[PDB]
Design a protein around this ligand. Sequence first.
Ligand SMILES: [Mg+2]
Ligand SMILES: [Mg+2]
Lengths: 53, 285, 163, 41, 237, 41, 42, 127
Amino acid sequence: RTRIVLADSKIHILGGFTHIRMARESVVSLILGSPPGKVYGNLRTVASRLKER
Amino acid sequence: SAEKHLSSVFKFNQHILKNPLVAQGIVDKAQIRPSDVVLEVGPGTGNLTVRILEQAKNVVAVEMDPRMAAELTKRVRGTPVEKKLEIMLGDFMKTELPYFDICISNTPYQISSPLVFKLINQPRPPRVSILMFQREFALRLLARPGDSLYCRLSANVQMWANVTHIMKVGKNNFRPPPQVESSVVRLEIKNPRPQVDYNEWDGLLRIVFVRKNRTISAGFKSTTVMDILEKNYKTFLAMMHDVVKEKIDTVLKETDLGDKRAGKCDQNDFLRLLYAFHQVGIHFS
Amino acid sequence: KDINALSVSPNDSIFATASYDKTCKIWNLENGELEATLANHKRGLWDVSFCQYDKLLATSSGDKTVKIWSLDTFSVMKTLEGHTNAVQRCSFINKQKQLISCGADGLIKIWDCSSGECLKTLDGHNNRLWALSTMNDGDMIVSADADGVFQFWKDCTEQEIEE
Amino acid sequence: KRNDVVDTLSKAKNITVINQKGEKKDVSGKTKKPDSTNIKL
Amino acid sequence: AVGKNKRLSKGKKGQKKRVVDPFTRKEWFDIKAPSTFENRNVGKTLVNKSTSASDALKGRVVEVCLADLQGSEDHSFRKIKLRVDEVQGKNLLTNFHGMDFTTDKLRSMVRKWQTLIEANVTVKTSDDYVLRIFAIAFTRKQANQVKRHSYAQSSHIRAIRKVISEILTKEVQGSTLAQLTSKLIPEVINKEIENATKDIFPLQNIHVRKVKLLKQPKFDVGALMALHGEEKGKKVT
Amino acid sequence: FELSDVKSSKSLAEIYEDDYTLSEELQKAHSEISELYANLV
Amino acid sequence: REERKTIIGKLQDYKIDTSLLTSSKRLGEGKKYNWRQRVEME
Amino acid sequence: SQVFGVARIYASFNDTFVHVTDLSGKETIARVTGGMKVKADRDESSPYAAMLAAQDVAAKCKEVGITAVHVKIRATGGTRTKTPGPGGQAALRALARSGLRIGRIEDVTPVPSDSTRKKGGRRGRRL
RNA sequence: CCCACUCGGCACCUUACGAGAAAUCAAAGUCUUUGGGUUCUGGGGAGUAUGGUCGCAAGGAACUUAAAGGAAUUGA
RNA sequence: AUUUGGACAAACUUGGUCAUUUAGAGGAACUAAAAGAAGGUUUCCGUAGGUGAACCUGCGGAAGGAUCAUUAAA
Ligand SMILES: [Mg+2]
Ligand SMILES: [Mg+2]
């Protein structure tokens, strides 16, 4: 539930405080080398949790 | 209604063997005398325990998972061997273990090195122990002086015991397959125990194995190593940085070990080094 | 490390010192010789209290526990657990029978030394309790909050049973 | 299914539990534990 | 974390009681800027009252934007440091101490597809005031240029740097600091650098990025008073 | 659950706005299903 | 072995406790007692 | 009639400092942090803690005499991130709401010309 | 700075009347089968066994009823 | 300082004698007992290490690893 602007090596994330931290972790995992498919799976897990609460 | 206590200790939140040949071999190589009480680590479902229970006076099975403990209980209830099994639950590093003659373990690899030394320091330690480690950790126990894998673990474990390889267990034998290869080893703790202080031996080894392929003298060049040895010498006198420097140089030169590498040194070479330091009054620990 | 508390035995024969180095040392009062060292807790000791009638010693720690030591054996008889935070004070009441303790959680817990169980919990404070004084074997107990609030507890077991 | 596990442990007598302190206590939660004079007299 | 669940610390044992409000004993003082600047009033500061107050005052450095001192937004991106040197009746006489730009302005000028030229010189004024000046310049593309970039060869950069160092050295040596500060405000130095280095290569955003004060001579109250442009007491009875 | 990998038509304000104010579409299909069944019968 | 036995034997002469010795692991870091019971009784 | 201070906001990843001082910066007028205003460690960096800290500082500043402030916000800088986080942004909004006049806003994060190695290691950090 | 040209360079885009099974290649091309000069080189992932070779340590006492001889807030 | 003798007298050791709780094993009574899903992880090369190693870690290097948005100006 955020918006991301990827300006070269500079990343900006717009959203709520808890939300941008969640987005930041996924972005950082991608930077560290995690393949996109594995990150996508975790996004589905957190995305599920977000609805129940 | 025991949930109050068992939930206060456990949360009720593994790679299971799938080759009967290794399990039978581990029991066979144990050579359990009929008058031997056996301690069984990582009993699991109970495949290995039941074979041990047949040949042993009593079997103490130490477990950490409450769920697997019930599985062991259900497999042995209402049987002739129920009276000879004592299932223990919980972390067993902290507790004082009973007396056992043989230890057969499908150890969790995380607790490998605490376990190897617990048996060694156990009062009246077991005579033979068949333990299952990973290939890397097992080879370092089995590493001989001058080998690439010779290390502090190799030297420490080889003076309180003798470790000999049994077998290699592949990642296919386990499901889900672990990413590391496994192997079985036997540990024979020496009786009588060598009459050398554990702290003194480990004290010398730690200083000299910081850089195992580096010369022994360079290990003693460190300022912190210089500082600690100075304080130890002061304590010896109580019951001088330049003085301890000279003392170290004489010992290394006379013993003809200062130009040698710890990765190519035997128990005798460390023992000779330890003795020479004691004569000069430097007690490592 | 810094010494936190000092306690004197009933006969003035020994006195104990509690330090933040996780140890309690019992000294012979006449000569100052070290009678024994009590080292079992995992955090620094905030208070030490001799039992005023028999040879027991209570030591309070930052590990959220209180332990009763037998002076004759210098060993931990009973360990009391249940405090959510560090225990700052510990004193014996009702002679050997009970022990009262205060903690940073603001809760005063009355324990049974023999069984080591929390009989009662008094909650009249909203901050840490540094000071705890007892009179007439704990018939009157005063605890001072860090906010500056006093709670003058009065024993009423005899009164309640009559009702 | 955990409650089924708990009842099985309590049912058995040759089971002891370790708290974080390392103490040996039985499933129910009480510390699990001959003298010549007692048996003869 | 002030919660009750927070673990107790050793430092909480003995704590000093707050029994005196510090601002009861503080005394306000007014800061005045040199005559080189249009607006002399640059705020006020406070000190503990003399038991002295002057000792803490002297050596105090305050940094303020030139826009406030000159009353025009054209200097919004430039800051001036002023150091207290003398005190007279709660008036703090200050002197120039340095100059610098805002970080946002510096980041704005630095852009891709152009060359960054920066030059520095350590030089003293006629007042024996040793100072260090930093200059920054960027290449620009001509009106009819079609290339995306406007890079300059290192020979041009070294030629431009030599010209800039000559101008910075010349002006500082042949001027006092009060005169030097008078030059900084209208940015006449930058226009001089533009014309001199222009034939070498067209340039843009030529500025004196920073000014440092490395050394000071013996303090002269007489000179300080002249820069700022004594008083009888009143009988107490 | 399925995660959308395409740009959301709803601006970030709209998603917050919508949640400020089991499924209408699911019930929409239900009504059509009944209509199709009734006509077929 | 006999060399090993002799060296360990001589270590017996030079042996001490290690409670006070700093461990090498630090290298990386760089009236009667109950008279009260009488007065209340009487 | 307008006395100016300097509101120095240091927005770290694990905390937020709101520090108001005189124009020189030698005299502290009020320092409040997110940790002082919250009950849990996890929430020290939260924007909610920052707003409470900013409001507390603003109340103290008005008592002393300060009616306007110059904001000098910064992040950890150095080898770490260079832009103030949401904690710093919340404190800035809180000060504006408090009624204190905001004079000039500048980012003064310590930006190294060149830096020493970061704490992560070769493979990175911030899992 | 602009335009046009010309040498040398890091590269790039579209195509090969060529090559290749293809990915693709200004070379990995030299109009069906072959010669411009010259140097070097060749003939994957899992296991099984070994009449083979070389290496690799330490050390100076069981016994209980098999069993309702039980469980049980749940039973007889 | 130190000595003789006379009473006061703490504290220590000892067998008894009264009071108080209090540990296991028995025996024999009374009372009470209204519940009922799934879910962490890029692949390597050279080198150096490993005692809570189902694998971890330091240094340099490679893709044989999935490029969206803005962007000539005015
Ligand atoms: Mg983090
Ligand atoms: Mg490698």
